[PDB]
PDB file of C-alpha atoms in Angstrom:
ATOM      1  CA  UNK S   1      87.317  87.547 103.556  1.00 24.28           C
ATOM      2  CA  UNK S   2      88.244  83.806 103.257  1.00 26.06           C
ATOM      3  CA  UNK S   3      87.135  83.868  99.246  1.00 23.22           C
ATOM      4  CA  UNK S   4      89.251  86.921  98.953  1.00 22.96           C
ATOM      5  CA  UNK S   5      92.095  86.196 100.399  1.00 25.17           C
ATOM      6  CA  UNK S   6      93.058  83.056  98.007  1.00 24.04           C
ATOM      7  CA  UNK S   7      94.662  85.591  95.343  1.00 21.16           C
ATOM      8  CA  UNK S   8      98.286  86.288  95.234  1.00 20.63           C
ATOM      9  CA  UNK S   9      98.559  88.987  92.585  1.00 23.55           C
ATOM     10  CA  UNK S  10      97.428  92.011  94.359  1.00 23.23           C
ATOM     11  CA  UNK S  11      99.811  93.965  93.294  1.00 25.10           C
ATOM     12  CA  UNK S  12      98.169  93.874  89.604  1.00 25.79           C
ATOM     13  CA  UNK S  13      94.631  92.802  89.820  1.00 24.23           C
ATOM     14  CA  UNK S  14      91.946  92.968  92.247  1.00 26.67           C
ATOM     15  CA  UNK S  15      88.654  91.857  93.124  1.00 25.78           C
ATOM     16  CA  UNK S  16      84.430  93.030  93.343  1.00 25.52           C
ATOM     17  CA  UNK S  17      82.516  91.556  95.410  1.00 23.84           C
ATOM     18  CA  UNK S  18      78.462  91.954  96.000  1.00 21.43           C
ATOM     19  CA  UNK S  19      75.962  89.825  97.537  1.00 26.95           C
ATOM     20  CA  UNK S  20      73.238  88.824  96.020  1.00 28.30           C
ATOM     21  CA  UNK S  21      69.993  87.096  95.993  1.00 28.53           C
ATOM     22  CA  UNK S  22      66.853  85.604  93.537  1.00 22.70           C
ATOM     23  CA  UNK S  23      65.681  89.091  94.264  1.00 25.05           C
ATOM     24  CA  UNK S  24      68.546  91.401  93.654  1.00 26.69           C
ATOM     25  CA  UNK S  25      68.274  93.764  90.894  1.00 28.33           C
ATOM     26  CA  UNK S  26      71.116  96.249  90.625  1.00 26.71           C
ATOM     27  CA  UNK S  27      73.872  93.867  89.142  1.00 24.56           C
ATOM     28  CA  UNK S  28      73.661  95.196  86.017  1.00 20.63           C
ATOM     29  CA  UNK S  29      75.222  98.609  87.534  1.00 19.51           C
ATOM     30  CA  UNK S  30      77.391  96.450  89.316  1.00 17.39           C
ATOM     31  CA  UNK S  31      78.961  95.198  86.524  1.00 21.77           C
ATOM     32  CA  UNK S  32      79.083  98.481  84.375  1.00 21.29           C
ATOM     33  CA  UNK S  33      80.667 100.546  87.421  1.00 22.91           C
ATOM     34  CA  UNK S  34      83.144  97.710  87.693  1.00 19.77           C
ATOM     35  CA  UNK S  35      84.155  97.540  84.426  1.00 19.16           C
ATOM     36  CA  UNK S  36      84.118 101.193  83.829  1.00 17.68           C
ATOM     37  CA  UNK S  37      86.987 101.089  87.130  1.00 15.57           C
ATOM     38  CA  UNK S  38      88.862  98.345  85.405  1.00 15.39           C
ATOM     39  CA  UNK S  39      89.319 100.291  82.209  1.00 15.66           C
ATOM     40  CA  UNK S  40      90.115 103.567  83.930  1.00 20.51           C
ATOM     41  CA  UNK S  41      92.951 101.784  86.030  1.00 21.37           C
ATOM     42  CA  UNK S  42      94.293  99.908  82.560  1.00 21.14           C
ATOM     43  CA  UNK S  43      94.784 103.014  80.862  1.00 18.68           C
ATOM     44  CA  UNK S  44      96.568 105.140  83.902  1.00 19.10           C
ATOM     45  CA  UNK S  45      99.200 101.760  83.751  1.00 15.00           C
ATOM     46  CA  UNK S  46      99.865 102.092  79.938  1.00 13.29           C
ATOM     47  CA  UNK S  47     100.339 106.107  80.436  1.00 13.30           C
ATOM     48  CA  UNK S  48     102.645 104.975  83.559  1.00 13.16           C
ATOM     49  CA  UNK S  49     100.770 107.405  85.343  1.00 14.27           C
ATOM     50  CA  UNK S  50      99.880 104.094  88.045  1.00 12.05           C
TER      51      UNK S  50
ATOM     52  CA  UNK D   1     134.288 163.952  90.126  1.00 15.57           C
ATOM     53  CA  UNK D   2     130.705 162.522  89.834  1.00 20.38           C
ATOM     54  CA  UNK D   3     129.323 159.319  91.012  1.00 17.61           C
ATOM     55  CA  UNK D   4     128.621 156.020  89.545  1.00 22.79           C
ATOM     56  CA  UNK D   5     125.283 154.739  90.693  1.00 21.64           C
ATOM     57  CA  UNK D   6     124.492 151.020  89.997  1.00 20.67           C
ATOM     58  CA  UNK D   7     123.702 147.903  92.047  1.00 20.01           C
ATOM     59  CA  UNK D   8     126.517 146.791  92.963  1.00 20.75           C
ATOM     60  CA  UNK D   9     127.844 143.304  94.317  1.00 21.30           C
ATOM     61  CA  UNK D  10     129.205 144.145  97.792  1.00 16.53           C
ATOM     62  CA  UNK D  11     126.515 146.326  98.404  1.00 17.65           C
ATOM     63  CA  UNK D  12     124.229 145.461 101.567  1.00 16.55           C
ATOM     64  CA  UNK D  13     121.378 145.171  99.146  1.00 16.66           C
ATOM     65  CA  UNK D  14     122.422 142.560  96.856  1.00 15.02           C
ATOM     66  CA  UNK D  15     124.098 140.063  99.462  1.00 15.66           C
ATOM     67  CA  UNK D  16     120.642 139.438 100.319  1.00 14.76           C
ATOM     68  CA  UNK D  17     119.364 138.798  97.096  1.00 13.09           C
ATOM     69  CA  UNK D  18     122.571 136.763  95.761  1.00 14.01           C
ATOM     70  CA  UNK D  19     121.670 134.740  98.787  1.00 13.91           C
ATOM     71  CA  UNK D  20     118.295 134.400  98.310  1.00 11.30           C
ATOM     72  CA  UNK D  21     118.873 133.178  95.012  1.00  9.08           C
ATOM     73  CA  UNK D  22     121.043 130.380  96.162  1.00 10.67           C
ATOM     74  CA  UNK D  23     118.379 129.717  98.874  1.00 11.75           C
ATOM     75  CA  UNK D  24     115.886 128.862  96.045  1.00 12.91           C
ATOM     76  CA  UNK D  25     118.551 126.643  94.189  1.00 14.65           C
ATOM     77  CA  UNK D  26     119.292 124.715  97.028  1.00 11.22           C
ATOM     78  CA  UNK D  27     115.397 123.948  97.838  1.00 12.90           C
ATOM     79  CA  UNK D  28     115.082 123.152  94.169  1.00 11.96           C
ATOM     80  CA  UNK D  29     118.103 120.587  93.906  1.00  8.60           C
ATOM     81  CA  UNK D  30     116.579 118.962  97.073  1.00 12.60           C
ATOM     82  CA  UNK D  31     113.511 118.561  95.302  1.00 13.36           C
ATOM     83  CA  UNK D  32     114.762 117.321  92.549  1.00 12.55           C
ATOM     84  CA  UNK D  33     117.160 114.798  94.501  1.00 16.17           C
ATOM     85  CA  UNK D  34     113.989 113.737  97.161  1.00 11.78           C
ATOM     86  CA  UNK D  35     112.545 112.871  93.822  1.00 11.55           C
ATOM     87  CA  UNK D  36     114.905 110.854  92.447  1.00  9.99           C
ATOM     88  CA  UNK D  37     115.936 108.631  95.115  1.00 10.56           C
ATOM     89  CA  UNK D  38     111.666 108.025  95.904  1.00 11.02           C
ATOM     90  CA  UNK D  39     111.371 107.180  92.256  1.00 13.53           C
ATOM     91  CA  UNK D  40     108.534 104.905  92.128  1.00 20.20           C
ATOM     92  CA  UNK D  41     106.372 105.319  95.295  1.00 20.00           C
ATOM     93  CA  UNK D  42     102.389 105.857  94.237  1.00 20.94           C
ATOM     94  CA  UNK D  43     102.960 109.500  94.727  1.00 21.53           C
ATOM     95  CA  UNK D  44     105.441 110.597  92.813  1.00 20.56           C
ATOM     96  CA  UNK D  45     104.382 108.126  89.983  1.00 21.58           C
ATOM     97  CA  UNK D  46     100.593 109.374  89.935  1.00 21.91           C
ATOM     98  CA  UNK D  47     102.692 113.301  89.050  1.00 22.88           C
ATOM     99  CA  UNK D  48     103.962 112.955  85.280  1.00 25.89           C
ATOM    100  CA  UNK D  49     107.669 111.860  86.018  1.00 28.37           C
TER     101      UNK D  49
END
């Protein structure tokens, strides 16, 4: 919440977060999911739909 | 003589429906106007302008 709370822009951008360890192993899907949610949102803004 | 038969205007028929009518104008114009003034809440943005 502390690490989170240090952006100002929330109104455009936001933030993932996901612990992890040495031992994690699901970042990879992380990532993709995230990224796949980033380009979604992008195009809804162009198309003024968001 | 005969008689005319048509729907007429002053008939006790068509006041309803002439009033009806302007019932479903009025909704739509307040619609239309609750729309405008909310222009760009998250709502009515997500709906194609």
């Amino acid at each position: 919440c502390q690490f989170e709370d240090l952006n100002r822009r929330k109104d455009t951008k936001e933030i993932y977060t996901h612990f992890t360890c040495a031992t994690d192993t699901k970042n990879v899907q992380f990532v993709f999911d995230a990224v796949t949610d980033v380009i979604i949102k992008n195009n809804l803004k162009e198309c003024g739909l968001y | 003589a005969k008689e005319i038969e048509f729907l007429s205007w002053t008939e006790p028929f068509g006041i309803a429906l002439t009033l009806f009518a302007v019932l479903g104008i009025f909704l739509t114009a307040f619609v239309l106007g609750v729309f405008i003034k909310f222009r760009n809440t998250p709502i009515v943005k997500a709906t194609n302008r």
